[PDB]
Design a protein around this ligand. Structure first.
Ligand SMILES: Cc1cc(CCCCCCCOc2ccc(C3=NCCO3)cc2)on1
Ligand SMILES: Cc1cc(CCCCCCCOc2ccc(C3=NCCO3)cc2)on1
Lengths: 296, 57, 245, 242, 242, 99, 57, 49, 49, 48
C-alpha cells in the first residue's frame, strides 16, 4: 500500500535534534577536592583544538585542589541584565539660525547604529528581539532648561512624514504623539517589538530589491527592511519661530531581551550607519603591542 | 486582565515583572530564571568525549 | 573510531581517514519547518535526494602566502544541480548544510586552516582607504557563488571584526599534523522560516590559514583545499518561473 | 486626592532604573517568535568559548597583523630557552584583548574564576618536543629561567597526536573578585605571569621545517563569573558616525 | 503624605496612552442604546468584503473616471495575448487603492494573509471565452508571455452562467507580516504580480458586441490580519476645512 | 451578482500546507482603532487682531474641522462612545507661559 | 459602588477596565472580547450556498 | 491617573529620612561576607570598655 | 540640566563636556534639572573585599 | 564539477588502502542484455 521509503522518509520532522540542554546556573561552579593522580591512560590536559570544541579540562585534574563553595551570582551576566541600561542612540538639533533643521521640525530616521557605545554592544549578536523604553531629554545647547512645548510623533513606515512645522500630519490622529514641555521631566515611553521578522537583525548579508544589483545600487547591500521602523518626528508646537534653539537626546533601554548567534566584537572604528566599513589605511590591531614576546 | 504581548512571550524562561497597563510589554524588565547551556558554543560536538579521554581515538 | 568517518547523503559518499570529529552548529540538527513556525500557506516541495547531496564545488591552492577565502552560502549552490533549479524557480527556500572542507598534505608538511561558519556575514569596504568615502562591496564580492572570494584584510574579515574571535562560531581547524578535513553541520539559521535563496545569504564559510603553510623544498608544493557541501532538509515554496537574481 | 509626599530623586532620569512606562501601541501583538538556532541566555555562555590569544602582539606593519595570532617555536641549540611570556590578566591591555573573554570583561568592573589557555601546536607531524608552560601567581617576578618558573603552577606539554594542551590558570587570589588590573596601584589585582620554556627541544628529521608555530586559545573555567558592569575602555570611536 | 517618587514620563501627554480622567458630568446616564442593524466589531469584518478594484487605473479625463472600474476584453486575432496586469500589493499605490481593503490598510503599518480577487465578466450571454489569471510570487519579473506566466499560481477561467471566478492570492511570504511595499527598498515586501492572458479567445456570434468588460472585485481571506496602526498616506487635505 | 463576497478557501484553490495562524486580531477592534487621541479643535486668543480679542472664545463643538480624524470616523454612519478630551495650550511659538 | 453609565453599557462584548471614579464612563478603554461576524457584510444572503457549489442552481 | 494630593514636606531632602531609592545596579550581587572577628552590633558594647 | 555618571574603575573617564563616554551605554547616569528636587540613588556594597 | 552531479565517493588515502565504489543497479529495465555500441547502447550502464 505504501512504498516503504515513504513510510520511513523522516522528511518532515519539525523538531530540532538538540544534543545540548540548558541547566540552572544561579552561582558559579563549585570546586570539589582533588588529589594526586599518577596514572597512564587518562590525560585531561591533552586536548585537540582541531575538533572545534573548547577544552573541558577541570581545575581539579590539573592541580590538587581544595573545596570551594562558590556562591557568586551569575545574575548580572544575563541579557536583560547586560542590555537593559539606557544609552544614547539618537540626537536631534532644532537651531534658530542654520541649515540643519530650521523651520522648527525634524525627521530622525529611527536607526540606533549612529552611536558607537550602544552600537558595539548589540552588534555582539546577529539577531535580537526585545521591547524598549525610549526616553527623550530635551534642552538648549547650553543644557539650559526652557519653557517650550514640543511634540514627538512616531511615524511608522508608510504614514505621512511631516513637511513643515505646521504640517497636517501633526494632527496625529492615529500615530502616537507625545506633547511635552522642556520643563517637564524627560518624556519616557514603552515600545513593543514591532517588526515583521521575529528578531531585529544587526547584520543582513544580502539585498532587498531583487533586481540587477549594479554599481549605483550597491547602496542597498546590507539594508534589511525588517529594521526600518520608520521615523521619529519632533517640532516646537506652534505657528512661529521657536524663540529658543533646541536639542533632543534620545535614550533607548532594552528589556525582555532574547539574543541569538553571537559574533566577534567590533575591532575597528565605525564609519557609517548600517554599514561595517572600516578605514583601509588605518587598520589598527585589536589590542596593545609589546616589543617582544619574551618581555613585558 | 492583561494582553500577552511582550518580546519574551512563550519564552522558556520565567520572569517576574511589575506592570500597571493592559499591555505586558510595558512591564518592567524584572528578575528572571538563571539557566545556561555552555556546550551549545563550547562543545557543539556530535560525539562527546570527556576530559579524561584522549580527544582523538 | 573517531578519526575515520563516512558521510552519506543522496547518492554521494565522503570518506575520511584523518578527520577530527564532527561539529554540529549551535548544537542543533537541521529540521523542517514546523506548522506553527511557517506562514507560507502553500504546500512546499521537499525534493529530498535530488537536492540533499554532496556538491564538490571548488578547489583553491594553499600557498606560503595565501590570505584566506570565503564563500557566501545560500548562494554558492545556485545554478549547480537540481538544488540550483529549485532555488531559482521558487521564491522561498529553507535548508541546513553539511559542509566538508578537505585538504591533505604529507607528514613532512605543516600548516593550519581555520574553518568557520559566520552567519549573516556582511562584507565591508576599506572606505577608499582614508575612510571618507562611503564605498560598498560589489555584487561580485558579496555574492561570489562558487569560486568564492579571497580576503584582502583577513585580520578583520574584511568587515572590521577580529578574526581572533571568529571561533565563537561553529568552527573546526585543519592542522596538517593532526587532520586533513573539517566537517561542520549548520542548521537553517535566519529570523524567518523561509527566505529567497537568491538575494539573502544566511552565512559565509571562512577558510583562513592562521599558521602559514610551509615545507622544505622538493616536497609536492601544490596543496589544494576543496570545498564540498551538502544541503539538508531542503524545502521550497512560492513557485513561479525561473529567476537568476 | 490621596495624600502623598514626593521624595528626593523625583523627576530624575536614571539610566539603569528599571520601571514601567506608558506603552505607545495599545493591543499591539508582536510577530510570533520562530525557533532560532544558537540562542544565548547569559554572557557567561560566551566566556567559556576559546578564542585566539594574541600572545605575539608585537607586529604592527598592517601586512603582518595576521602573525600576531601565533607565536613561533623552533629547534633550539641549548637548554631551557624562553619561548614566550605574558600577563595572565584578562581585562588588561595585552594579548588577552584579542579574545572574546577579554572583550566581555571590558564590560564588567570585576570578575572571579579560573582561566584556561589551550596551546595548539601547528608544526609538522614529524616534529617532536616538550614545552613547559608555567603560571606564576602574584608577587612572583617574571622568572629569569626555567628552573625558577617551574616552582609555580605548571605543565609539561608533549607533542603528539593530541596537538594541543591546556594550561589551567586556577583562581588563586586573596580577594573574592578582581577589578581590572592596570599598572599603577591596581597591579594589586594582577593575576600573575605565564611563561613558556623549552622542557627539552624542538626536534626534526632532515626534510621538515626547522621552525613551526603554536596558536594560543583562551577562555574561562566553569566557576567564572563577573559583576558590576560598566562600559568598555578598550575602544571608543574618533570621528562621528556618518 | 504617603512617600512617592515621580518617574520620567511625568506630565507627558501620550496620544495613545489609555488611562482614566475626571468625568465632567456626575451621575449622568446616557440615552439607552437601541438595537441598530449592521453593527461592526472589528475592522477585519470589513476587509473581507469585496469592493471594485480599479485595474484599469489609466483614464483621468474626469469624464472617463467611471471607466477605471472595469477593463475590456474583446475578440483577439491570435494566441495568448495579454489582457491586463497589476501589482498584487494592497497597501501600495495603484488599483488596490480603489478598494475598501486598500483603504483600511493605509491605516495599519503591516499585514498578513491571503487575498482574493473575483473577476466578473459582463459581456453578452452569447460570448464565450477562457482567460488565464496568473499570480506570480515575489522575484518573478512581469511575465513576457502566457507560457511563462502559467508557471506560477494560476487559474483558467471559463465563461458561463457563473459570471465570475475568484483568483486566490495565497499568503506566500518569507516574513510573517508585510509592511507596505513601496518601490525603493521596501519592494522587499512586494506581494507579486497578477496578469491576465487569453487562454483561448473571446468568441461571439454575428449580432453580439465584439468587445465586453470585466469588473474586478477584491478583499482579504479569512486568515488576514493587520497590526501596528498609523495614519493613512493615500490622502491628506490641502485647504483648511472652512 | 448575488451580492456576496467569494467564499473560496485557499485550500480549494491550491494544494496547501498546514499553518497555525496565531496572529492576533486585537489591534483591529474599534476601541483599538479609534481610541487614539487626535486633533479636532483649535482656538486662538491673540492680543492684537479680529479673530478673538477681548480674551475669550466660543468654539462650536464640531469634530469635522480636521481632515485626519474626520475621515476615520466618517467610515461609519453611526457611532456611540465616550471620549477623553485633552487641551494643550501655549503661545503661537509653542512657548509655555504663566497664564 | 459605581454608576453603570458608559457607552458600551449592556453591550454583548465583555470589557475589563480600570477606574477610580463613581462614573463608569471615566474608566479606561481596556482589553475586550474578540468576536466577529463577517457574513453580516460578506454573506448577507438569504439562502446560503457553500463554496463547493455553483452559486446559481 | 489615580487622584493624589501632595502634602507639605514634598521635595524636601531630610538627612535622617529613611526611605527608598532607585538602585543603580540591577541584579548586582555583593561579594559574599566572610566571617570577621570582633563584629560590633551596638555602640553600647564599646561604652562598657 | 546636569548629568551625573558613575564611572567604575576601568570605564573610560570623560575628557570633555562633549566626550563620547557621556553616551553612558552601560554606566549608570542620572539626568537632572537643578530645579528638580535633589537626585537620590541607592548604591549596593560594591567591592571585591 | 560535472562528474560529481552523479553517484560518487570521495576516497581518502589512509591505512585502509582501498575504497569501494558501488555501481547501483539503476536501470529502466529489469534486466540488461549485453551493451554493444550500435542500438544496444540502450543497455549501457553508464560511465565511471
Ligand atoms: C511616543 C514615541 C515613541 C517613539 C519612538 C519609538 C521607537 C521604536 C524603535 C524600535 C527600534 O528597533 C530598532 C531595531 C533595529 C535598528 C537598526 N538600525 C540599523 C539596522 O538595525 C534600529 C531600531 O516616538 N514617539
Ligand atoms: C471640562 C470640559 C470638557 C469640554 C468638552 C466636552 C465635549 C464633549 C463632546 C462630545 C462630542 O461628540 C460629538 C459628536 C458628533 C460631532 C459632529 N460634528 C459634525 C456632525 O457630527 C461632534 C462631536 O469642555 N469643557
Amino acid at each position: 500500500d505504501r512504498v516503504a521509503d515513504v513510510i520511513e522518509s523522516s522528511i518532515g520532522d519539525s523538531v530540532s535534534r538538540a544534543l545540548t540542554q540548558a541547566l540552572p546556573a544561579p552561582t558559579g561552579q563549585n570546586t570539589q577536592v582533588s588529589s594526586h593522580r599518577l596514572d597512564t591512560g587518562e590525560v585531561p590536559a591533552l586536548q585537540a583544538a582541531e575538533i572545534g570544541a573548547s577544552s573541558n579540562t577541570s581545575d581539579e585534574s590539573m592541580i590538587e585542589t581544595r573545596c570551594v563553595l562558590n556562591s557568586h551570582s551569575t545574575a548580572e551576566t544575563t541579557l536583560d541584565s547586560f542590555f537593559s541600561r539606557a544609552g544614547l542612540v539618537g540626537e536631534i538639533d532644532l537651531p534658530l539660525e542654520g541649515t540643519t533643521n530650521p523651520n522648527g521640525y525634524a525627521n530622525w530616521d529611527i536607526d540606533i547604529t549612529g552611536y558607537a557605545q550602544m552600537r558595539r554592544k548589540v552588534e555582539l549578536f546577529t539577531y535580537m528581539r526585545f521591547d524598549a523604553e525610549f526616553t527623550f531629554v530635551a534642552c538648549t545647547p547650553t543644557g539650559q532648561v526652557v519653557p517650550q512645548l514640543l511634540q514627538y510623533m512616531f511615524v511608522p513606515p508608510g504614514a505621512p512624514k511631516p513637511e513643515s512645522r505646521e504640517s497636517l500630519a501633526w494632527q496625529t490622529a492615529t500615530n502616537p504623539s507625545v506633547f511635552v514641555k522642556l520643563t517637564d521631566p524627560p518624556a519616557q515611553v514603552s515600545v513593543p517589538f514591532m517588526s515583521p521578522a521575529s528578531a531585529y537583525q544587526w547584520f543582513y548579508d544580502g539585498y532587498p530589491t531583487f533586481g540587477e544589483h549594479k554599481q549605483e545600487k550597491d547602496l542597498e547591500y546590507g539594508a534589511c527592511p525588517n529594521n526600518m521602523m520608520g521615523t521619529f518626528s519632533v517640532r516646537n508646537v506652534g505657528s512661529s519661530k521657536s524663540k529658543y534653539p533646541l536639542v533632543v537626546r534620545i535614550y533607548m533601554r532594552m528589556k525582555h531581551v532574547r539574543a541569538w548567534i553571537p559574533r566577534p566584537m567590533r575591532n575597528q572604528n565605525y564609519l557609517f550607519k548600517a554599514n561595517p566599513n572600516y578605514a583601509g589605511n588605518s587598520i589598527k590591531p585589536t589590542g596593545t603591542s609589546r616589543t617582544a614576546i619574551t618581555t613585558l | 486582565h492583561e494582553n500577552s504581548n511582550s518580546a519574551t512571550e512563550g519564552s522558556t524562561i520565567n520572569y517576574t515583572t511589575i506592570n500597571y497597563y493592559k499591555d505586558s510589554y510595558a512591564a518592567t524588565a524584572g528578575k528572571q530564571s538563571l539557566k545556561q547551556d555552555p556546550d551549545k558554543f563550547a562543545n557543539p560536538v556530535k560525539d562527546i568525549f570527556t576530559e579524561m579521554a584522549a580527544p582523538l581515538k | 573510531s573517531d578519526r575515520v568517518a563516512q558521510l552519506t547523503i543522496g547518492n554521494s559518499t565522503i570518506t575520511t581517514q584523518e578527520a577530527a570529529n564532527i561539529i554540529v552548529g549551535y548544537g542543533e540538527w537541521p529540521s523542517y519547518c514546523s506548522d506553527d513556525d511557517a506562514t507560507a500557506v502553500d504546500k512546499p516541495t521537499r525534493p529530498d535526494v535530488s537536492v540533499n547531496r554532496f556538491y564538490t564545488l571548488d578547489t583553491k591552492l594553499w600557498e606560503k602566502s595565501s590570505k584566506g577565502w570565503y564563500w557566501k552560502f545560500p548562494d554558492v549552490l545556485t545554478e549547480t544541480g537540481v538544488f540550483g533549479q529549485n532555488a531559482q524557480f521558487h521564491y522561498l527556500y529553507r535548508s541546513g548544510f553539511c559542509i566538508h572542507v578537505q585538504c591533505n598534505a604529507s607528514k613532512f608538511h605543516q600548516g593550519a586552516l581555520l574553518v568557520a561558519i559566520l552567519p549573516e556575514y556582511v562584507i565591508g569596504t576599506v572606505a577608499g582607504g582614508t575612510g571618507t568615502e562611503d564605498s560598498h562591496p560589489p555584487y561580485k564580492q558579496t555574492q561570489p557563488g562558487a569560486d568564492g572570494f579571497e580576503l584582502q584584510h583577513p585580520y578583520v574579515l574584511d568587515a572590521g571584526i577580529p578574526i581572533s574571535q571568529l571561533t565563537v562560531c561553529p568552527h573546526q581547524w585543519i592542522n596538517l599534523r593532526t587532520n586533513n578535513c573539517a566537517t561542520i553541520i549548520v542548521p537553517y539559521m535566519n529570523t524567518l522560516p523561509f527566505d529567497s535563496a537568491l538575494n539573502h545569504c544566511n552565512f559565509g564559510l571562512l577558510v583562513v590559514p592562521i599558521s602559514p603553510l610551509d615545507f622544505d623544498q622538493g616536497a609536492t608544493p601544490v596543496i589544494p583545499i576543496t570545498i564540498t557541501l551538502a544541503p539538508m532538509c531542503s524545502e521550497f515554496a512560492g513557485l513561479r518561473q525561473a529567476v537568476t537574481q | 486626592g490621596f495624600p502623598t509626599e514626593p521624595k528626593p530623586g523625583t523627576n530624575q532620569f536614571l539610566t539603569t532604573d528599571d520601571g514601567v512606562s506608558a506603552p505607545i501601541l495599545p493591543n499591539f501583538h508582536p510577530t510570533p517568535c520562530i525557533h532560532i538556532p544558537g540562542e544565548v541566555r547569559n554572557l557567561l555562555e560566551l566566556c567559556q568559548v576559546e578564542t585566539i590569544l594574541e600572545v605575539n602582539n608585537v607586529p604592527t606593519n598592517a601586512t603582518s597583523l595576521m602573525e600576531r595570532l601565533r607565536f613561533p617555536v623552533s629547534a633550539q641549540a641549548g637548554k631551557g630557552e624562553l619561548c614566550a611570556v605574558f600577563r595572565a590578566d584578562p581585562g588588561r591591555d595585552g594579548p588577552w584583548q584579542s579574545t572574546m573573554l577579554g572583550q566581555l570583561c571590558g564590560y564588567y568592573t570585576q570578575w572571579s574564576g579560573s582561566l584556561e589557555v589551550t596551546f595548539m601546536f601547528t608544526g609538522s607531524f614529524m616534529a617532536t618536543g616538550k614545552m613547559l608552560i608555567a603560571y606564576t601567581p602574584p608577587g612572583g617576578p617574571l622568572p629569569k629561567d626555567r628552573a625558577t618558573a617551574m616552582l609555580g603552577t605548571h605543565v609539561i606539554w608533549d607533542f603528539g597526536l593530541q596537538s594541543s594542551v591546556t594550561l589551567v590558570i586556577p583562581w588563586i587570589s586573596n580577594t573574592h573578585y578582581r577589578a581590572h588590573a592596570r599598572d599603577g596601584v591596581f597591579d594589586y589585582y594582577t593575576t600573575g605571569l605565564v611563561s613558556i620554556w623549552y622542557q627539552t627541544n624542538y626536534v626534526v628529521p632532515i626534510g621538515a621545517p626547522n621552525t613551526a608555530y603554536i596558536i594560543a586559545l583562551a577562555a574561562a573555567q566553569k566557576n567564572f563569573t563577573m559583576k558590576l558592569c560598566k562600559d568598555t575602555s578598550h575602544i571608543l570611536q574618533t570621528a562621528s558616525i556618518q
